[PDB]
């Protein structure tokens, strides 16, 4: 359905990306609208002096690619004058930049010619007409990929921006598996960037990284499709796929992973007290909805009436969809009025929808969770499975039983 879509442009991906890449500054070439969106979705981070700025396109900047590119070079040089700490610059494309047809790929090359050893300028497009929400993150990662050095050693490879605690616990469990040194593409600094080659088979931690998956396939790396680490079972099958690819014995794997699986099961059971026998609706927000529905329906016992995804990458999400029950209705494309009528008719007990839609549905009487929190808060692996379960346990439906 082609209608109004209440989803974020991919410049929102910058907001959580720069927290993982402490060496990278993201410069957005956009209008006042893009800067306003970036600051609104950042919230307090913009008060915390973060590493994203918007080179605002002025009226004189609209006419003339050479003039606008010269002013862009001026601003970039001024920024590295202020910020010699950062070595990575991302010339994030934006909707007005695309309409101007201001080539930012060329600009990245020119700035790399200027101060390449000092700063490595990458380039991707977070524009709304091109990219939606976490597609900004995966576009940034896919931009990073081609420049990455080649390696000739088979190493375990992790793709996706994760909190440092989640990344540490993930690599910890991968190490207790015993086989396969780990590496993460969104490296905190460009110095510790990974080497990507045909031998390094890569595992994707977050579903929406489809462009990054394609870019890694161009490098020769093959993908091990697996259900993403949301909850105990998804994390278990993710680690099991990784272990099978690296030939870890089944009994050894079960023995090493039993304790965190038991803790995650206890935590999800404790959190999912009011979740059993409940109906959950998903609006297209963050491409996490398929794995979200899998986790909720299986571990939490919450039947999914409709799973809405802005872009469904069937090839990578195949194991997760296989884990998902036949009952949930996966839908592609977003018409906000059609999906609003659908949630109104279905009368879901919980609706995981956008923040611009969350409060209206609460006013109408629908319990709503906003999925924008999910990309922020740690919701991956066992140690956060309980928090992930409780996040849907009380986005009301624990407050509804308290307010009403």
């Amino acid at each position: 359905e082609r209608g109004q879509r209440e989803v974020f442009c991919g410049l929102t991906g910058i907001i959580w990306l720069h927290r993982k890449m402490q060496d990278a500054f993201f410069l957005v070439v956009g209008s006042r609208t893009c800067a306003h969106l970036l600051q609104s979705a950042a919230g307090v981070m913009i008060f915390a002096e973060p590493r994203f700025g918007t080179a605002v396109l002025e009226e004189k900047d609209l006419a003339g690619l050479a003039d606008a590119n010269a002013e862009l070079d001026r601003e970039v040089d001024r920024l590295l004058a202020r910020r010699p700490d950062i070595r990575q610059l991302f010339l994030v494309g934006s909707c007005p930049s695309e309409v101007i047809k201001l080539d930012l790929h060329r600009a990245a090359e020119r700035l790399s010619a200027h101060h390449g050893p000092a700063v490595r300028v990458y380039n991707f497009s977070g524009s709304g007409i091109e990219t939606t929400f976490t597609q900004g993150e995966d576009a940034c990662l896919a931009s990073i990929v081609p420049t990455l050095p080649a390696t000739e050693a088979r190493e375990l490879l992790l793709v996706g921006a994760l909190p440092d605690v989640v990344e540490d616990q993930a690599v910890s469990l991968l190490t207790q598996l015993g086989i396969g040194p780990v590496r993460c593409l969104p490296a905190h600094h460009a110095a510790e960037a990974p080497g990507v080659g045909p031998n390094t088979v890569f595992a994707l931690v977050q579903p929406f990284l489809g462009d990054t998956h394609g870019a890694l396939t161009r490098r020769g790396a093959r993908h091990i499709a697996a259900p993403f680490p949301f909850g105990e079972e998804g994390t278990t099958l993710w680690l099991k796929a990784i272990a099978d690819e690296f030939g870890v014995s089944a009994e050894t794997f079960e023995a090493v992973t039993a304790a965190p699986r038991a803790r995650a099961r206890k935590a999800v059971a404790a959190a999912s007290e009011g979740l059993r026998g409940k109906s959950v609706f998903f609006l297209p927000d963050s491409q996490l909805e398929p794995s979200l529905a899998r986790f909720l329906t299986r571990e939490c016992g919450m039947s999914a009436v409709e799973v809405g995804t802005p872009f469904l990458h069937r090839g990578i999400l195949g194991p997760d969809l296989d884990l998902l029950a036949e009952g949930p209705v996966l839908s592609e494309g977003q018409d906000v009025e059609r999906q609003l009528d659908r949630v109104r008719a279905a009368r879901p007990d919980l609706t995981v929808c956008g923040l611009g839609l969350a409060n209206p549905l609460e006013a109408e009487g629908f319990t709503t969770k906003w999925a924008i929190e999910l990309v922020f808060t740690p919701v991956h692996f066992y140690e956060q499975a309980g928090d992930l379960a409780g996040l849907f346990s009380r986005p009301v439906r624990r407050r509804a039983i308290l307010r009403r």
Partner: protein, 419 residues
């Protein structure tokens, strides 16, 4: 290409959006790229509104260009008419749609929708969100407000209040109470409480009350020319400005002043010996020009503060800002850049800062007591409690809010010395 991290004002379409969500029956059909619906979150969370903003977006992509994008615009306006069923439709375009060559007005006429349709040509790159709200309100008034018979009893229009405005709801309530105590009813509150019918009735009011010039001055100057409705030049923030407002409203209406002082407490709690230490405390002020000009008078003439910094981010009110700051022996800081106000605060090193939310965070990093007085705010700066900044109860709220940081700093220092 100036590198911007914080903007004090959004794009003009955001202000027009505030005007749209203020009224009922007015839908903003915005020509915008997919992902420009972020500002709905502002209304649903910042202001905590029960209903979705009356905004319909085209949300075009790269596959839809030329004939397609115009077709999506047609579909968006038609769908808005069919399912939202508003009494009036107002059509605008975002920055990206401003660049692309699609005439917002022409397609609306092509639809020939029965409801009145206003087209707002808002320069996205030249102008900002306050101009967007002002020009949107002006266009709405031009299309719907017409000369009409005056009301039998004296009535006024509260011009300026919009959604996402700072303390606009409680200020509406307080000024309404002040006028009913004065014998003047409120004909309409536009656009925060108005509708196409109410915008039509705007011409029935004897005079307008320009509550917020930032968003209402264009409509006031148009209604002073087409509807022959003079508007009050004084904004009633603080005791002195409240008395000035009461005097001008009595003069315009012809009624007796009749100001209700019985609940006033700002004068005494400022004259009490507990407020003696307030004397000579230096205050820095920034924000929209109206609030800064009013708050400087409150801080000096009513609280014993000395104003060391006086500025506005709203360059539209540059002459009034500078003229006000000249009366305090200062040069007005008319800047849209927060690093400039940061430099001003660091140079002046005030004892209290009264400004927007970025001003508050600058103070918190610098360890200076801070209170919020201006439009750019958070969800936390929209109280559930009655918190007017205008009128006599607004004076009490002002005193408490401006004194709380100083009281909390004094108490913390005393505890630090004691322990």
């Amino acid at each position: 290409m100036k590198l911007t991290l914080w903007t004090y004002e959004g794009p003009p379409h955001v202000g027009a959006m505030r005007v749209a969500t203020g009224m009922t029956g007015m839908h903003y059909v915005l020509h915008a790229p997919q992902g420009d619906t972020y500002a709905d979150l502002l209304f649903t969370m910042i202001e905590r509104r029960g209903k979705r903003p009356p905004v319909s977006y085209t949300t075009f992509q790269a596959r839809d260009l030329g004939s397609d994008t115009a077709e999506l615009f047609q579909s968006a306006c038609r769908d808005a008419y069919e399912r939202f069923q508003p009494q009036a439709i107002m059509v605008g375009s975002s920055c990206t749609a401003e660049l692309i060559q699609d005439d917002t007005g022409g397609l609306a006429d092509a639809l020939s929708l029965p409801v009145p349709v206003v087209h707002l040509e808002l320069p996205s790159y030249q102008r900002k969100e306050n101009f967007g709200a002002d020009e949107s309100f002006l266009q709405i008034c031009r299309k719907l407000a017409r000369p009409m018979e005056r009301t039998e009893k004296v009535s006024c229009n509260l011009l300026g209040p919009t959604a996402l405005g700072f303390r606009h709801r409680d200020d509406i309530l307080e000024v309404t109470r002040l006028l009913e105590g004065m014998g003047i009813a409120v004909n309409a509150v536009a656009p925060m409480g108005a509708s196409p019918a109410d915008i039509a009735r705007l011409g029935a009011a004897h005079f307008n009350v320009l509550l917020y010039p930032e968003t209402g001055e264009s409509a006031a100057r148009w209604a002073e020319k087409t509807l022959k409705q003079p508007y009050t030049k004084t904004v009633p923030i603080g005791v002195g400005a409240t008395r000035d407002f009461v005097a001008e409203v009595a003069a315009l209406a012809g009624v007796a002043p009749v100001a209700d002082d019985s609940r006033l407490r700002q004068p005494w709690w400022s004259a009490s010996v507990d407020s003696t230490y307030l004397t000579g405390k230096r205050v820095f002020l920034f924000g929209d020009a109206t609030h800064v000009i009013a708050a400087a008078r409150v801080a000096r003439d009513e609280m014993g503060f000395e104003v060391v910094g006086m500025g506005c981010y709203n360059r539209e009110f540059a002459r009034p800002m500078r003229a006000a700051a000249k009366g305090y022996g200062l040069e007005a800081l008319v800047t849209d850049d927060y690093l400039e106000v940061e430099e001003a605060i660091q140079a002046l090193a005030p004892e209290l800062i009264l400004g927007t939310q970025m001003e508050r965070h600058i103070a918190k990093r610098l360890g200076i007591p801070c209170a919020v007085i201006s439009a750019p705010v958070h969800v936390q700066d929209f109280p559930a409690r009655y918190s007017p900044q205008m009128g006599f109860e607004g004076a009490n709220v002002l005193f408490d809010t401006w004194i709380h940081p100083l009281t909390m700093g004094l108490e913390e220092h005393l505890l630090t010395m004691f322990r």
